[PDB]
Design an enzyme around this catalytic site. Sequence first.
Site, short mmCIF file in Angstrom:
data_model
loop_
_atom_site.label_atom_id
_atom_site.label_comp_id
_atom_site.label_asym_id
_atom_site.label_seq_id
_atom_site.Cartn_x
_atom_site.Cartn_y
_atom_site.Cartn_z
N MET A 39 0.82 -1.21 0.00
CA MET A 39 0.00 0.00 0.00
C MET A 39 0.86 1.27 0.00
SD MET A 39 -1.24 2.65 2.05
CE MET A 39 -1.38 2.22 3.78
N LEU A 40 1.87 1.30 0.86
CA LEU A 40 2.76 2.45 0.95
C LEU A 40 3.61 2.65 -0.30
CD1 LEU A 40 3.84 2.09 4.68
CD2 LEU A 40 2.29 3.80 3.68
N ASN A 43 1.40 4.15 -2.83
CA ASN A 43 1.05 5.49 -2.38
C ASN A 43 2.03 6.55 -2.86
OD1 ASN A 43 -0.43 7.43 -0.57
ND2 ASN A 43 1.54 7.42 0.49
N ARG A 44 3.28 6.16 -3.08
CA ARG A 44 4.27 7.09 -3.61
C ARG A 44 4.29 7.11 -5.14
NH1 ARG A 44 7.85 9.27 0.22
NH2 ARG A 44 7.54 8.40 2.32
N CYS A 143 -18.38 9.33 -6.63
CA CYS A 143 -17.59 10.28 -7.44
C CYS A 143 -18.39 10.91 -8.58
CB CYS A 143 -16.34 9.62 -8.02
SG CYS A 143 -15.25 8.75 -6.87
N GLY A 300 -10.62 9.64 -11.02
CA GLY A 300 -10.79 8.55 -10.07
C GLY A 300 -9.42 8.08 -9.62
N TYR A 302 -4.97 8.30 -11.34
CA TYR A 302 -4.14 8.70 -12.45
C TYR A 302 -4.43 7.87 -13.70
CZ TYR A 302 -0.13 10.23 -15.11
OH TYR A 302 0.68 10.76 -16.09
N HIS A 364 -21.02 5.26 -8.70
CA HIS A 364 -21.40 3.89 -8.38
C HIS A 364 -22.57 3.46 -9.25
CE1 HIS A 364 -18.67 3.67 -4.97
NE2 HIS A 364 -19.10 4.87 -4.61
#
Lengths: 376, 377
Positions: A39-40, A43-44, A143, A300, A302, A364
């Site tokens: 996940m991390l 995240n970057r 969204c 939503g 990139y 949705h």
Amino acid sequence: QSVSIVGIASRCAPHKLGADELEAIARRHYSSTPSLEKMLEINRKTRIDHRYSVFSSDHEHWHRPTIPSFSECDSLFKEYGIPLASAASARAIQDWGGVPDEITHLVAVTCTNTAHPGFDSVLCRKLGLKCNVRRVLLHGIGCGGGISAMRVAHELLLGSTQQGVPARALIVACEVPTVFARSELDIMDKTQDVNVAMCLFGDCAAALVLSNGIGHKASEQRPIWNILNCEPTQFDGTEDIAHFNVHDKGYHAIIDKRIPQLTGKCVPAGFQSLISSTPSLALEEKNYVPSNYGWAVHPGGYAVLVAAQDALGLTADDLRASYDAYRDGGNTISTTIIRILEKLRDEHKHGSQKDKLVLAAFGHGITLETAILTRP
Amino acid sequence: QSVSIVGIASRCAPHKLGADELEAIARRHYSSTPSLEKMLEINRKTRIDHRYSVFSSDHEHWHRPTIPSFSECDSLFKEYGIPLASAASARAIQDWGGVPDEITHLVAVTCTNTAHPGFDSVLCRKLGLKCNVRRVLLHGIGCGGGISAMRVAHELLLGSTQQGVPARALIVACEVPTVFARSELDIMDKTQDVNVAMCLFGDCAAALVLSNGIGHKASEQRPIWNILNCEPTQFDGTEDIAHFNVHDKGYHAIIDKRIPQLTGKCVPAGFQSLISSTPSLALEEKNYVPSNYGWAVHPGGYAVLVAAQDALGLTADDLRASYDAYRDGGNTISTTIIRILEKLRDEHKHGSNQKDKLVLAAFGHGITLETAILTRP
């Protein structure tokens, strides 16, 4: 007589939630697991420079040992979210130029709060709106909510034009997804299912004022865009893609990996469909070329921007305001499309665009919301 | 060129939840406490003969040792509410006479579910609505929701009249409050705060089809009522009155005791506003006399009906269809006003003489009063 946008404003939360900050929060509460590390890492790579949260780094939200209850998540939205929505709403009213007394309609949307009365009710008091203001609180769309609110307000305002009476709609979107950040981290820890929603979402409120043009006063801003048409599409066999599911500690996000492929398939269909249902455009073949339009697309993620850009034959520069909003703010759900409109308005104020502008956003359903806007 | 109601249907859940049923459920999981005894005693006094629940007496909902999670409360609504909503919607479409393809708008409402996508989305698939049907799911309004749906749909349809295109709206209200019955009982046990919501609420779905009258086909039923005007009012200093607050196991209702007193003060106020904001009625003084109208009032509680009845100078016979709905079905939240309209439609088919103008009224969260004025064609 057309419905027009006459006021725009938006307000991100004040506190940056950069990769460093999210990592510091995560590692503070969970020992390394393969899902956490993945996940991390993701995240970057999101290509978001800045996301914002209503919670500063020293806030108890990020330090407390327990996961906030649903009750606490609701209180937090009331404490931080509603003021964010009042400020954005007031700023749009100020941009419009009119007085709160003459807002006839209120169209509100959020997917990060559920309450009775909804937050639109509180907002009426905060803004000093008339006791018989006509409110709508949209739910269930996610969204796609910003354009969804536009679609509704547009048709409501045509309803008043039919009766020959003034109408001014305030549209307000308010999202505080970081309220649920503690719950999502816990669910990802326990299940070991990577939850990319951790990396994408930020807090924001944003508002528009629309007018049906009747009873125009001198203090009011002239139309920025006219809204020509709005057209939704629900696509078959897509329900199990993106869900925002209620549970004990709030709402949990499920972001399917096939979202960008789906985007490439569906946006060109939605676009054609929108043009075909617009009587003053449906006939001519040039109106069916995406590049003949300006474009605002909900980021939503990139990859979603790229898929749509490619599928529509556009360049990244055509979608510059959408990339910019995503890069500085993240995915702010229903508010993002209004932030893009504000960027487009600002660019043109300082010299720049094309005559027709298409808005598009997946919600949705899976549902695609579209709108076509025109330079007055 | 009027917006009209051309289809009406409702569908209560199938399992009766009479006083004995509630007591049986209560005493099964909780020992006697003053709060439980006071609730059960109040429960026999509500003047509701029948309430309905999607959960039969032998269903595990009533027997399980644990309180359902929010996730389960969601699944239960999906499992029981949505089919109730499909049947109710389908029946209204059949009353209308038109085809699903011709439905242009969907206006949905519930306060007993939160979901993304909302239940309206599933409903589009079950009913075979066109892929570009224009959906609205209302939130935050509770008991006022049936009329606010009407308000919204009315105006949306007027917007299609403005463009000169046909419009047909399906309005769908779906409420399954007995899903949260286990949670509410638990909270009442733990806090010893008597929760009257235990006694009042029941499950139901109901629907209307509305038309802007453009492109009328022969298959379609002529207008039942024309909708002339809808008028909402939010009242100052009424926040603490009625909350439906989220928590870990669903929603918890807070019903304030000052509700009927507030009803008597506010309904006449709201009725005046409605008339004076109706250009074709606002001038003449007779039009401001409540008894010159038919009435349908959302029975938040028996005492709510009485307050309004008294303050409007009406008789209980004027509100017969509202009392009847309350007595057989209870407070079914957003659906109740549509159930009353159905009773009113049915009586008229059976020779019942009724007035030319009909007023709808309902208190929602706010506190907001939703009103509408309908006229015989």
